[PDB]
Amino acid sequence: LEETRYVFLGGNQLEVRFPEHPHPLFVVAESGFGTGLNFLTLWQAFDQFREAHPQAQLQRLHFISFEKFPLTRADLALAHQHWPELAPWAEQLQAQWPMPLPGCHRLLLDEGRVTLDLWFGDINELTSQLDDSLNQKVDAWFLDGFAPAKNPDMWTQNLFNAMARLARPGGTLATFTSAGFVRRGLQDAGFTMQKRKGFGRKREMLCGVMEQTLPLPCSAPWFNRTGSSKREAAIIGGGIASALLSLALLRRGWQVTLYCADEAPALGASGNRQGALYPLLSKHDEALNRFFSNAFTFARRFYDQLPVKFDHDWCGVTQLGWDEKSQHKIAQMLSMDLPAELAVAVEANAVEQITGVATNCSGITYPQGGWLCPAELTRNVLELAQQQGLQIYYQYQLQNLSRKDDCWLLNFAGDQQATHSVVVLANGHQISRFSQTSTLPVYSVAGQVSHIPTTPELAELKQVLCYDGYLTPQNPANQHHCIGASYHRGSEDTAYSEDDQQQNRQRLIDCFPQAQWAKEVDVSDKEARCGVRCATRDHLPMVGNVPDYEATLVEYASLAEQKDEAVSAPVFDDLFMFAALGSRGLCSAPLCAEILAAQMSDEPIPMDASTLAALNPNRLWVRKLLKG
Numbered sequence: 001l002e003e004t005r006y007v008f009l010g011g012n013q014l015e016v017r018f019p020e021h022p023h024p025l026f027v028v029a030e031s032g033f034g035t036g037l038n039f040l041t042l043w044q045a046f047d048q049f050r051e052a053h054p055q056a057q058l059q060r061l062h063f064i065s066f067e068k069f070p071l072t073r074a075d076l077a078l079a080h081q082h083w084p085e086l087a088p089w090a091e092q093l094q095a096q097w098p099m100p101l102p103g104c105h106r107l108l109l110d111e112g113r114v115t116l117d118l119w120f121g122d123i124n125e126l127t128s129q130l131d132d133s134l135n136q137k138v139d140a141w142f143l144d145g146f147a148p149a150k151n152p153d154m155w156t157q158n159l160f161n162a163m164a165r166l167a168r169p170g171g172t173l174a175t176f177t178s179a180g181f182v183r184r185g186l187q188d189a190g191f192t193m194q195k196r197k198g199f200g201r202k203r204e205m206l207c208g209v210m211e212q213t214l215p216l217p218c219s220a221p222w223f224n225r226t227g228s229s230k231r232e233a234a235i236i237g238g239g240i241a242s243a244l245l246s247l248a249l250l251r252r253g254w255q256v257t258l259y260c261a262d263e264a265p266a267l268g269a270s271g272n273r274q275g276a277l278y279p280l281l282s283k284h285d286e287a288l289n290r291f292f293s294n295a296f297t298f299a300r301r302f303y304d305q306l307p308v309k310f311d312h313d314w315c316g317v318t319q320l321g322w323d324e325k326s327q328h329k330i331a332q333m334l335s336m337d338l339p340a341e342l343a344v345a346v347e348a349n350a351v352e353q354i355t356g357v358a359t360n361c362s363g364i365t366y367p368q369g370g371w372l373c374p375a376e377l378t379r380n381v382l383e384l385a386q387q388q389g390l391q392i393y394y395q396y397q398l399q400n401l402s403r404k405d406d407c408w409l410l411n412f413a414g415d416q417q418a419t420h421s422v423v424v425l426a427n428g429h430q431i432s433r434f435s436q437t438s439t440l441p442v443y444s445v446a447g448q449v450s451h452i453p454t455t456p457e458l459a460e461l462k463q464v465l466c467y468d469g470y471l472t473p474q475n476p477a478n479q480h481h482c483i484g485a486s487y488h489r490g491s492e493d494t495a496y497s498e499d500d501q502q503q504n505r506q507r508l509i510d511c512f513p514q515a516q517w518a519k520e521v522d523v524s525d526k527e528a529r530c531g532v533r534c535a536t537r538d539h540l541p542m543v544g545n546v547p548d549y550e551a552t553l554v555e556y557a558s559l560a561e562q563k564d565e566a567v568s569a570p571v572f573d574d575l576f577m578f579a580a581l582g583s584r585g586l587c588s589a590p591l592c593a594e595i596l597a598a599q600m601s602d603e604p605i606p607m608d609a610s611t612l613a614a615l616n617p618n619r620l621w622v623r624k625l626l627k628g
């Protein structure tokens with residue numbers, strides 16, 4: 001343990017650099033996370049640092065690391081037992097220890113003080129897939145793992161080059177090994193290397209620093225994500241998206257203001273009483289599946305950590321093949337062989353025990369999922385945000401935006417205007433109401449969810465059912481269930497429809513004609529909540545810089561043939577969008593808020609270049625332009 005401190009903290013001059021670090025955030029990357037020893041050690045060091053030097057500018061730690069073969073958290077725990085001194089940190093690390101899914105996993109520890117990005121996979125396979133936003137963001141490197149002798153496999157020119165790419169100018173690195181090919185390899189990668197006495201009986205150790213500013217690669221500029229240098233932003237919003245975002249920004253030292261068109265928040269699509277938390281898995285869409293898996297697990301972690309009162313139960317969500325198409329989608333999902341803590345098959349006989357209700361058919365189950373009250377969540381997250389200093393103006397409806405020299409002029413309804421440095425459009429299905437956004441491949445889908453009274457037999461239902469519509473367990477606070485899914489493409493109408501009311505029960509009955517419990521559902525009270533989803537085909541949100549449609553057509557007019565020498569993606573200055581959350585919003589919103597707030601602050605974004613491109617707003621125009 002003292003050798004850990006020596007090698008990795010000492011080798012990077014961290015205890016000295018910290019209090020002199022002229023930035024709010026410090027970024028550290030690690031070739032393997034192993035048992036998490038190095039990270040815990042560093043975390044302790046960081047806490048001691050903050051405790052001893054409150055005046056210091058550096059308030060936040062960011063730690064990126066890789067593990068190819070993660071641990072079961074039981075083994076992680078009893079591994080952590082060897083170092084009792086670190087317990088108070090390790091416990092936290094365990095509390096949030098992520099599920100063994102591929103890709104990037106963000107953990108928010110110590111209420112944001114310490115951010116950990118765990119990438120599960122082969123580090124050499126993953127360096128390729130890392131996002132450009134990560135280039136030169138790394139202040140210090142822990143090059144660690146099994147000794148080069150006895151495991152040369154990890155130590156490759158690939159790795160050295162990658163470390164060189166991510167290390168910011170003046171950034172450092174340290175490793176326990178003095179091995180030659182490592183030194184010369186790191187020198188080829190562009191580091192300036194120095195030997196240093198090893199710890200105790202061991203021999204010389206290596207540490208170096210990047211003493212030059214290398215050229216930044218920018219592989220595919222049409223997809224690239226830029227932030228802002230300005231720290232003051234306005235959000236147009238009042239739904240879950242805006243709330244989560246505002247937390248994420250305030251956390252990062254942003255001065256935030258929210259304008260909402262309605263009297264209160266959560267009167268848009270986020271206004272439901274009960275809504276379902278679960279991932280959309282795809283076997284044949286890589287991005288979609290990656291994103292929903294990681295965003296779903298992050299979502300649960302986040303919701304657990306979030307210090308807010310909101311009705312909810314994670315009771316598990318069960319999805320039944322009631323017919324062919326469904327049985328088949330389910331089948332594919334089960335064919336992709338995923339950890340059972342994510343999704344697992346359920347036979348028709350087990351279905352009654354698990355859901356409390358007999359569907360007379362098999363299905364799949366997401367055990368970590370459930371229902372939550374989105375309206376209460378949004379409302380209360382916003383309240384928390386105001387405490388944190390969020391400035392909210394209700395009844396401000398944004399009519400149009402104009403770009404002045406250093407800012408954005410916002411023109412609202414009712415003769416009101418504001419002026420802000422940065423602007424984010426969070427406003428839901430109305431995202432397209434502005435000239436800058438009018439061409440976006442998003443569309444309105446109105447929908448109606450019915451509020452039904454609970455009954456002794458329905459009270460037996462322990463999980464959210466997903467069939468054609470969906471039926472939630474009752475929320476005991478109101479003694480009702482939500483049952484829903486009315487779907488109208490192209491419709492912005494929020495008016496109650498008796499047709500939809502009736503179709504909500506109908507779908508259920510139709511899916512389980514033999515089931516007595518289902519006949520219990522009673523919509524006769526004409527009670528429902530209606531809202532307008534903003535959707536895309538491909539089913540992913542649009543999060544990032546608002547692209548300039550015309551410029552994007554003019555430039556890129558060729559692309560194709562001309563893919564080199566291309567300009568960065570044409571974009572409006574300091575204008576970002578968080579939108580097209582679909583029907584899956586409670587799942588995607590937290591990690592999106594993270595991705596966007598990270599992007600705007602020029603910090604590390606917790607996701608790979610591909611899935612990120614899959615989330616990008618200029619997506620369709622760009623891929624159509626790539627060919628004809």
Ligand SMILES: Cc1cc2nc3c(=O)[nH]c(=O)nc-3n(C[C@H](O)[C@H](O)[C@H](O)COP(=O)(O)OP(=O)(O)OC[C@H]3O[C@@H](n4cnc5c(N)ncnc54)[C@H](O)[C@@H]3O)c2cc1C
Binds near residue numbers: 242276277428585
């Ligand atoms: C019928 C239905 C069922 C759903 N089921 C689920 C579910 O099962 N699981 C799940 O996770 N999600 C569900 N959702 C929600 C889905 O996730 C939505 O996409 C999500 O609620 C979007 O929230 P948002 O913050 O992006 O926009 P919204 O919640 O619609 O909020 C947009 C906000 O922007 C404001 N605004 C609009 N224009 C302006 C302007 N010009 N100036 C100022 N303010 C403006 C509005 O006041 C509004 O408050 C459901 C939604 C509906 C309608």
